[PDB]
Structures are given as structure tokens and as C-alpha cells.
Scaffold this motif. Structure first.
Motif: not given
Ligand SMILES: CCCCCCCCCCCCCCCC(=O)O
Ligand SMILES: [Cl-]
Ligand SMILES: [Cl-]
Ligand SMILES: [Cl-]
Ligand SMILES: [Cl-]
Ligand code: NI
Length: 556
Positions: A91-118
Motif C-alpha cells: 500500500g501507500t506508506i509515506p514517511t520521512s527518511s528518519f522513520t524506521p518502519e512502523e515508528s512514529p515519524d519525527p517529521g510529523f510529531w516534532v513540528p507539532n512540538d512533541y519530542v520523539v524517542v526511539k
């Protein structure tokens, strides 16, 4: 404004980032070129001295932020993957290059003023410790990382976990320990009872996906000698014994605010336990979203990111938004492949479900409103992949079936002391052709519902069983004698489907997989069941005392 990003910057090429604090630019899917900080290869020390390795993505500014976390043993620095040609049905799976499969994408969360810890869990990345997937010991390590995160300079104290598949299963696990700073969780498609959900189906060992998955972990960290041998565990623990009981999450311990995703399309891996998690969690604040579409595609779809964010803005930012207006269950009623209607309810199982029996008749391949008065027997060769028995009912009016179904059979065998039974529910359109649905693992020629049972494992847990969902103890084997006729109840996994007036439901019973093949020829991404007890003819009895029937969850 800042959510358009800065097209003057160059995106940080991810394989070039080094250990330590980095200022990077992320190729955000939603928000263009986004500057942030990435701390790569930070460590958190466990109670026993083991170090776990992490990455932290955070806004390039002072302040305290809510924290989104995920954890697995697949690799924290995986660049997401010719997949178009090799696994076309993903299917169609759009993510930034900093998103290991299935993970929260920091390109979505961080601009919304969240921290992402992997988080790289024990045994993965630079940790060469014990790698025991989906265990309490792994959960204990995760708990330490949650509590550590709550105390960092960039943390507002509220941690929410989020992620798909392994990244979801680990959330059911850590939440059962009630970490004090885990304030919300989004287990987006995850099992939580390995014996019932991935290692065996109905007691029949998965010789496909389970083994592929296990081998994959071993292949990922070949220099770790401490990886648990789950291939051998499957061989030597055929029953739900003390070993496997430690791999069933104690779900009623979970109190954390909860957004679950389950999918009709993941029967045989995450579906059963996704629903179990939602149902059994003690959480006073819990929601369920069910779809009949593709797994990672749906996770990363913009509407579902916005849903995740609305839940986390309420629980992690403590914003008085209108999250709690959300109906507790939102579900798809599937009509055709990628065609359905979303509805809502206050509970799952649906409080308006009418569990309705349809009685099987072996003589004429029918399912019936009325009981069948006289005992007859039907037969198929359990080793002939082309043979099955089937039973049909054509609807006189539009009917919605949403929930579990229970297939009760009376069965015997002459040539073996056990039987492997493969059940399926199919929908046939008004022309009499099968209507296919997304099914496991990302196949498009799937069916409505699937279930399995090894008949020596038939003994029911009376307390836990319901009329629509049998629950098998899997405590001891009850082997069969020649022509011993026994009652079995087969768990058809939860499904949501419209049968229009003129359309047909078909039950199929067979000695091997009902839908054949997978979507990755040469690679075992789907369950397989090639180690069978079947030999010779299977008998199926209907009528009279043999009240073989299908319980269907009629709703709406
Ligand atoms: C193609 C590579 C195999 C995909 C591995 C899937 C693991 C998972 O779903 O958790
Ligand atoms: Cl509601
Ligand atoms: Cl009808
Ligand atoms: Cl149900
Ligand atoms: Cl149990
Ligand atoms: Ni570039």
C-alpha cells in the motif's frame, strides 16, 4: 508559517548523522523541510547495568515537551526501505527518511512540538544482552526508559507510546506494569498472547510467518549470542504451559488511557489480540478504531495521524480539546475490497449484536434458520488440497455481521488420532463469485474471516468462552479413537462485513489453508501450517444430536 517548513535548507541525508547532538533537517511528509535536533546513540542504563541505545528527536529550542516513544528490537536507525516490485500490496506508506518502519515519524510529531524517542530494546543495536521478544523482562527495560524520559530537561513529564506491530505488542506489555509517567498509549495493531496469536493457531503451529519473523531477528543481530531461540520454543512447548503463560500479557492490569487500532485485515497475527487488549484493559478512558484496509498504510494516513495527535494533545499536552467526544468504537463495515462504511458504537463487542445460529446440513451444503432434525455425515480428504466441505446461506435482506463468529462442528476421523481443521467464512456476490478482502499478510484475495483448530486441543475454558468466541484451554491433548465423534467450536476471528440482499455467506471447512499463497513468492510473510496431524478422511456430522451451527453477530 512554520508548518510549511524551510525550503532553503537541505535535508540531512540520514546515513550521515553521527553519535551525539545533531542539528538536522527532516524531509517531513506533511510539513516540508523541518529543522530539529537529533541526539543519536544516547544510552539509558538498566537496573542490572545493561545499556540500551536510543535516538531523541526534539525541537531546536529550550523548553519542556510531551514525549512520544516507541521501542523494538528491529533497529533504531533503520532507513525505511524496490519494495514496489518486491511487495506490491503493502500500500501507500509515506514517511520521512528518519522513520524506521512502523515508528512514529519525527517529521510529523516534532513540528507539532512533541519530542520523539526511539528505543533500541535489549539485545538490539549496540546492546548484546538477552533478546527475549514480547516478554516481561523486555517490558521491564521499556518501563525504565519511560521513567528516564520523564525526568529529562526536554520532557514535560508525560510519555505516550505509539507504534505498529512489534512496536504495539511492547506497549501492551509495558502498560501492564503501569509506569507512573506513561500517560497514554496507541498500540496500533498488536498481539499480546503469543501462543494463541502467532506461534500456533488453534494449537496448529505456524510454520510460516512465525518462523520467518523469528529468523529475521536472529539475522538482524548475528553478533549477539543471547537471542532467544523461539523456533525451538515452538517445537518444545506445544501446549499453553508455564512458558507460554509468561507470553500472555495480563491485560486487566492496564489502566493507561488507550487508543487501540485493530484491523479486519490482520487475522492470523495482530487482529485477535488487538481486540483482546481493548476489551480486557481496565483503562477508564479507552477507544478502539477498526478498519478493513492495509496496516502501515492506515497508520501513516493523514486522518489517522490527526486522530493520534488529537488523543495525545488531550493526554500528553493536557489540552481541553474535544477528544472525549469520540465514540468508544469506530469500525468499518466492509462491502468490497477498499469499499465500506464506517460506523460507531459505545462498546465492543457491539451492544446491539444478536448472536444468531445458522445450522449446517451435510446433505445439501446449506446453512439454515431451523435445526436439522436427522443426523447425516459429510466427508472430505484432509490431505487433498482441492477438497473441502462447504455450507451456504443467501440473505433475503441487507445484513451486517460485526464481531466474532463461532463454528460448532461434530467431527471424527478414522486414520489419525487427531485432526487439523481450517475454517473460513467467504462472501459470494449476487453472481455467485467470491468477494475478496484485504487479509493477512497484505494479500488482496482474502476472505471474510478465518479460524483454526487442532481437535486434540478442543477443550473449552468455560469461564472465558462466550457464545460467539470459544476460548480453548490448550492445557492437555485429548487424542481421538477411531470414529470417536467429538464436538468442537472453532474461533472465527473478528470481522466486519455487509452481506447485501441476494449475497451469500459461505462456511468452508478443510484440512489445509483455505486461501492459498501469499503476496511475496519465495518469502514466508504469511502464516503457513505445513506440520499437520491430518491423515485420510475427515467426517463432519450435522443434524439430530449433532447440532453443528455457525453463530453470527448480526448488528445494525
Ligand atoms: C519484507 C520484510 C519482512 C517484514 C517484517 C515484518 C515484521 C512485523 O510486522 O513486525
Ligand atoms: Cl461511545
Ligand atoms: Cl436474511
Ligand atoms: Cl462479538
Ligand atoms: Cl488463557
Ligand atoms: Ni538530498
Amino acid at each position: 508559517q512554520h508548518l510549511l517548513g524551510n525550503p532553503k535548507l537541505t535535508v540531512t541525508h540520514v546515513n550521515e548523522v553521527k553519535a551525539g547532538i545533531n542539528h538536522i533537517v527532516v524531509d517531513s511528509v506533511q510539513y516540508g523541510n523541518q529543522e530539529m535536533i537529533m541526539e543519536k546513540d544516547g544510552t539509558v542504563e538498566m537496573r542490572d547495568g545493561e545499556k540500551l541505545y536510543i535516538n531523541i528527536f526534539r525541537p531546536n529550542k529550550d523548553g519542556k515537551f510531551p514525549v512520544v516513544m516507541s521501542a523494538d528490537t528491529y533497529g533504531k536507525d533503520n532507513k525505511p526501505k524496490n519494495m514496489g516490485a518486491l511487495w506490491p500490496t503493502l500500500g501507500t506508506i509515506p514517511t520521512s527518511s528518519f522513520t524506521p518502519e512502523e515508528s512514529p515519524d519525527p517529521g510529523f510529531w516534532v513540528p507539532n512540538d512533541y519530542v520523539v524517542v526511539k528505543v533500541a530494546l535489549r539485545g538490539s543495536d549496540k546492546s548484546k544482552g538477552v533478546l527475549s521478544p514480547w516478554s516481561k523482562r523486555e517490558a521491564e527495560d521499556y518501563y525504565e526508559v519511560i521513567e528516564w524520559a520523564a525526568n529529562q530537561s526536554w520532557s514535560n513529564g508525560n510519555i505516550g507510546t505509539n507504534g505498529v506491530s512489534y512496536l504495539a505488542v511492547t506497549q501492551w506489555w509495558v502498560a501492564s506494569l503501569n509506569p507512573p509517567h506513561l500517560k497514554a498509549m496507541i498500540p496500533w495493531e498488536g498481539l499480546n498472547d503469543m501462543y494463541r496469536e502467532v506461534a500456533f493457531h488453534g494449537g496448529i503451529p505456524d510454520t510460516g510467518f512465525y518462523r520467518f519473523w523469528t529468523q529475521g531477528i536472529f539475522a538482524r543481530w548475528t553478533d549477539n549470542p543471547n537471542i532467544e531461540d523461539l523456533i525451538q520454543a515452538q517445537q518444545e512447548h506445544p501446549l499453553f504451559d508455564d512458558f507460554w503463560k509468561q507470553r500472555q500479557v495480563p491485560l486487566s492490569q492496564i489502566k493507561t488511557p488507550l487508543l487501540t487500532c485493530a484491523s479486519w485485515s490482520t487475522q492470523g497475527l495482530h487482529n485477535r489480540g488487538s481486540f483482546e487488549g481493548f476489551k480486557q484493559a481496565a483503562s477508564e478512558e479507552k477507544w478502539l478504531y477498526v478498519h478493513g484496509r492495509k496496516e502501515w498504510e492506515s497508520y501513516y494516513a493523514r486522518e489517522n495521524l490527526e486522530r493520534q495527535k488529537s488523543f495525545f494533545d488531550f493526554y500528553l499536552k493536557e489540552e481541553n480539546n474535544d477528544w472525549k467526544d469520540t465514540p468508544h468504537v469506530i469500525y468499518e463495515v466492509r462491502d468490497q475490497f477498499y469499499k465500506g462504511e464506517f460506523k460507531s458504537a459505545s462498546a465492543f463487542p457491539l451492544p446491539n449484536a444478536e448472536y444468531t445460529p445458522l445450522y449446517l446440513n451435510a446433505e445439501n451444503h446449506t446453512l439454515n434458520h431451523a435445526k436439522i432434525s436427522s443426523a447425516h455425515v459429510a466427508q472430505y480428504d484432509s490431505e487433498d488440497k482441492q477438497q473441502d466441505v462447504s455450507f451456504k446461506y443467501t440473505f433475503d435482506k441487507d445484513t451486517e455481521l460485526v464481531g466474532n463468529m463461532n463454528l460448532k462442528l461434530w467431527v471424527s476421523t478414522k486414520d489419525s488420532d487427531d485432526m487439523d481443521l481450517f475454517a473460513g467464512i467467504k462472501k459470494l456476490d449476487r453472481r455467485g463469485n467470491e468477494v475478496n478482502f484485504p487479509d493477512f499478510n497484505h494479500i488482496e484475495n482474502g476472505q471474510v474471516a478465518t479460524g483454526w483448530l487442532r481437535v486434540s486441543h478442543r477443550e473449552l475454558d468455560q469461564e472465558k468462552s462466550s457464545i460467539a468466541q470459544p476460548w480453548h484451554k490448550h492445557e492437555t491433548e485429548l487424542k481421538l479413537s477411531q470414529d470417536e465423534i467429538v464436538p468442537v467450536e472453532i474461533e472465527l476471528l473478528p470481522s466486519g462485513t455487509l452481506f447485501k440482499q441476494g449475497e451469500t455467506l459461505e462456511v468452508v471447512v478443510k484440512g489445509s489453508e483455505i486461501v492459498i499463497g501469499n503476496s511475496t513468492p519465495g518469502m514466508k510473510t504469511r502464516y503457513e501450517h505445513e506440520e499437520t496431524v491430518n491423515k485420510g478422511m475427515h467426517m463432519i456430522y450435522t443434524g439430530g444430536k449433532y447440532d453443528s451451527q455457525l453463530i453470527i453477530p448480526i448488528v445494525n
